[PDB]
Design a protein around this ligand. Structure first.
Ligand SMILES: CCc1ccc(Cc2ccc3c(c2)[C@]2(OC3)O[C@H](CO)[C@@H](O)[C@H](O)[C@@H]2O)cc1
Ligand SMILES: CCc1ccc(Cc2ccc3c(c2)[C@]2(OC3)O[C@H](CO)[C@@H](O)[C@H](O)[C@@H]2O)cc1
Ligand SMILES: [Cl-]
Ligand SMILES: [Cl-]
Lengths: 306, 306
């Protein structure tokens, strides 16, 4: 036992990272089959970003202007095109390391792993979640744009995110692999502010289920509640309303533990009202919301990937 | 910016994981060059573990009894030998994926990443630290024995840990790659209890330096202290005494931030005495001690690995 914020093994995605340089800008790209995906702002300069017209900035570029390096070998670019906020560079070699993969657009509250990269070289891996206000709370220095978020199922990598920018508040915005941003964010430097960072209540309960499975049970109480009562409390603490679909996704953890979902909501409610009183749950002194119900089951079941 | 508990990319180690079965027991092994390392308790049954005599249990084994599978291909075992608590199985093929690597025995307070594996297949990766009482607080289900902890420098993997067992308290014990356990723990089921889980003060300050670099500065105050005063406080809160070598390792973060190490200790001191008052630092409501000073510099500098 033990429960930890665990990322997916990163090897399969490490094999797709490449460096992309246009003019003076270098960032990362993702090499899948014979196509290299990267943020389109690689073609921008520093003022270019105040109010760029990418359609016009790309007119000045040709295939030979995009220097793509995979490890120490240069890749040949035979085509380029813009799709939403991403450029797709067609190279003349298929990546030999391409895993089986899919492109998916995730929902707020879902989690995924990030392989932070600089200059096409991996730096580290950590788990993140798509926040209800559509930002992620990552770790990104300059040059990390183009690093991707992903989940792995069996032997299929589902890419879900590509990094594009940092708000003045230090949180992060990006796109899916079709180039569409999560949320209202745009790839220009402007007054962009994030909405409320509401907590993903269904992940919190999942994590409370994890704790009981992993021996922490002090928060369990003699009470129960209803969805309509619970939700008055979640609305007061800036929590996502809990829904019947969520109660349903929590069924399996409820079955394995024998603790009814609504009794667990009653545990969460008292914790919101009274705090933890200086105690801890799974090593944390605050309620954790970046573990989905699939993530607790997966980690508590030892699911592996081939 | 942003600061997160980041693991090392796991691809290089994913290429060394293999399944090891002796009789009915399956666990993981590490395939480096032509040798496969795994816990010696793979040769034990269930009662065998109360007070095993591995010397005698191994006398009953031969090379053909150790079934080593790498992905879907079986490996041929041409030799086996015990070194402390690990068995070394010599196979007739060198692993083609062997990275450059080293075996190191770490010091308490040092951190490393774990690639949790089941049946020779990776499941996830997370960062851990060797605790002052020589246990690690991991995530391990049955079948995870043999998963390794590691750090990567440049393109050299320094293996530092191999998982072997769980104490009744849910914390974990293991060995280095030479087969010697960290701490007093032995590979038998007995009354083994962990000593105090003291906090690694030099990592805490490192993380306080990370927070200031990442915009959290509310804990900074108008005070300073001395090592001898500070240490009276660390001793009262079950913190490791801070030493001059530690002040020295913190120099670079002190230089980059302009906050004197002893002023930062004065910040840590008030936090120990008054608590955080319901606020948070780098997203945590408690003081984090599993980031070493090298880990903050590395993550805040974008160091990558080839
Ligand atoms: C085969 C051995 C094994 C596997 C997994 C676990 C841990 C575990 C954690 C979390 C969940 C579950 C199991 C699970 O879903 C939520 O529990 C449901 C009700 O018992 C069950 O119907 C599901 O098939 C599923 O096992 C223990 C032992
Ligand atoms: C080249 C661009 C760059 C690199 C790294 C960073 C972040 C950074 C974080 C943490 C530390 C340091 C830097 C560092 O050690 C601790 O700061 C010391 C005093 O300035 C310096 O002497 C060291 O070389 C080292 O830069 C910013 C910009
Ligand atoms: Cl916390
Ligand atoms: Cl974490």
């Amino acid at each position: 036992s033990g429960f930890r914020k665990m990322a997916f093994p990163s090897g399969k995605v490490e094999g797709c990272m490449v460096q992309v340089t246009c003019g003076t800008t270098t960032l990362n790209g993702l090499w899948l089959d014979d196509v290299v995906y990267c943020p389109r702002h690689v073609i921008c300069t520093s003022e270019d970003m105040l109010n760029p017209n990418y359609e016009d900035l790309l007119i000045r570029k040709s295939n030979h202007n995009f220097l793509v390096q995979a490890g120490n070998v240069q890749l040949r670019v035979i085509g380029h095109s813009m799709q939403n906020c991403v450029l797709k560079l067609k190279v003349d070699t298929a990546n030999p390391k391409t895993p089986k993969y899919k492109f998916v657009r995730i929902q707020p509250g879902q989690t995924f792993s990030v392989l932070a990269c600089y200059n096409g070289s991996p730096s580290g891996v950590y788990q993140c979640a798509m926040r209800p206000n559509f930002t992620i709370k990552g770790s990104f220095l300059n040059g990390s744009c183009g690093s991707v978020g992903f989940n792995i199922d069996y032997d299929c990598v589902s890419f879900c995110y590509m990094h594009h920018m940092e708000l003045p508040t230090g949180v992060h915005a990006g796109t899916d692999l079709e180039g569409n941003f999560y949320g209202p964010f745009v790839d220009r430097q402007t007054a962009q502010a994030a909405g409320t960072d509401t907590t993903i209540t269904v992940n919190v309960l999942a994590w409370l289920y994890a704790a009981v499975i992993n021996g922490d049970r002090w928060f369990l109480n003699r009470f129960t509640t209803t969805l309509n009562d619970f939700n008055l409390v979640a609305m007061k603490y800036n929590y996502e309303p809990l829904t019947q679909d969520h109660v349903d996704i929590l069924g399996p953890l409820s079955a394995q533990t024998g603790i009814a979902v609504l009794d667990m909501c009653a545990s969460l409610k008292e914790l919101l009202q009274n705090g933890m009183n200086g105690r801890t749950i799974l090593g944390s002194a605050l309620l954790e919301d970046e573990f989905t119900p699939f993530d607790v089951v997966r980690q508590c079941s030892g699911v592996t990937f081939q």
